[PDB]
């Protein structure tokens, strides 16, 4: 049963205008089977629009490609993104008053490198408010997190969203 195609796509920005379907494919095939690979071009001039997309056979292959950044394709460092509000911070709700830093860290560190964990407390009483913010060193962590249907931390079913 294949993962939805949308979750297997990488948008690739910042291409060299000399990158082609073939050279984009030869590069990104290093990290998995590509079912699709397209450079976007002007319909009249055929001049590159400077971005394209690749579709892998599996989500684990998307992960491998993102873990191999930075990608230099035909001499230029490109910008791959999954299926954009590009942020490095998430809101984590529903953690109640018994969730601590290490609960959040042990779970979220497997999505990416954590730089900040902020467990929110009441300005007047100091009591925990039941939500937190986690800041990562890179946006792909957040992108992986927010497409999951479920997040379970410290036994709690959590609501997780991009934080701006
Ligand atoms: C950057 C992450 N991301 C990109 C999309 C996307 O659909 N790309 C926009 C686009 C596609 C083709 C065009 F011709 C013009 C614009 C979705 N998420």
138 neighbors 79 (Cβ within 8 angstroms): no
Q: Which residue owns the Cα nearest ligand 1 atom 18?
A: 83
Q: Which fold has domain 5-82?
A: Alpha-Beta Plaits (3.30.70)
Q: Taking the domain 89-162, which CATH number applies? A: 3.30.70.330
Q: How is the chain split into domains, by residue range? A: 5-82, 89-162
91 neighbors 104 (Cβ within 8 angstroms): no
Regarding the beta carbon of 83 and ligand 1, being less than 6 Å apart is answered yes
Distance CA 102, CA 16 (A): 43
Distance CA 35, CA 81 (A): 17
Q: How was this structure determined?
A: X-ray
Regarding the beta carbon of 11 and ligand 1, being less than 6 Å apart is answered yes
Measured in Å, residue 75 CA sits from the centre of ligand 1 at 23
Question: Which parts of 7-58 are beta strand (E)?
Answer: 9-13, 34-41, 48-56
Out of 84, 85, 142, mutate this one to test ligand 1's pocket (max ligand atoms within 8 Å of CB): namely 84
Regarding the beta carbon of 91 and ligand 1, being less than 6 Å apart is answered no
Q: Which two tokens stand for residue 128?
A: 């925990």
Q: Which residue owns the Cα nearest ligand 1 atom 7?
A: 83
- Fold: same for 5-82 and 89-162: yes
**What is the separation of C-alpha 18 from the centre of its chain, rounded to a whole number of angstroms?**
27
How many secondary structure helices (H) and strands (E) does the chain include? 4, 12
């Amino acid at each position: 049963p294949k993962e939805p195609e949308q979750l297997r796509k990488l948008f690739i920005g910042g291409l060299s205008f000399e990158t082609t379907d073939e050279s984009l494919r030869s590069h990104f095939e290093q990290w998995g089977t590509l079912t699709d690979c397209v450079v976007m071009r002007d319909p009249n001039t055929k001049r590159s629009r400077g971005f394209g997309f690749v579709t892998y056979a599996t989500v684990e292959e998307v992960d491998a490609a993102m873990n191999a950044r930075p990608h230099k394709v035909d001499g230029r460092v490109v910008e791959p993104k999954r299926a954009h509000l590009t942020v490095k911070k998430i809101f984590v709700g529903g953690i109640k008053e018994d969730t601590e830093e290490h609960h959040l860290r042990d779970y979220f560190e497997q999505y990416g490198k954590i730089e900040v964990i902020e467990i929110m407390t009441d300005r007047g009483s100091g009591k925990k408010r039941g939500f937190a913010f986690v800041t990562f060193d890179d946006h792909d962590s957040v992108d992986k997190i927010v497409i999951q249907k479920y997040h379970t931390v410290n036994g709690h079913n959590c609501e997780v969203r991009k934080a701006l």
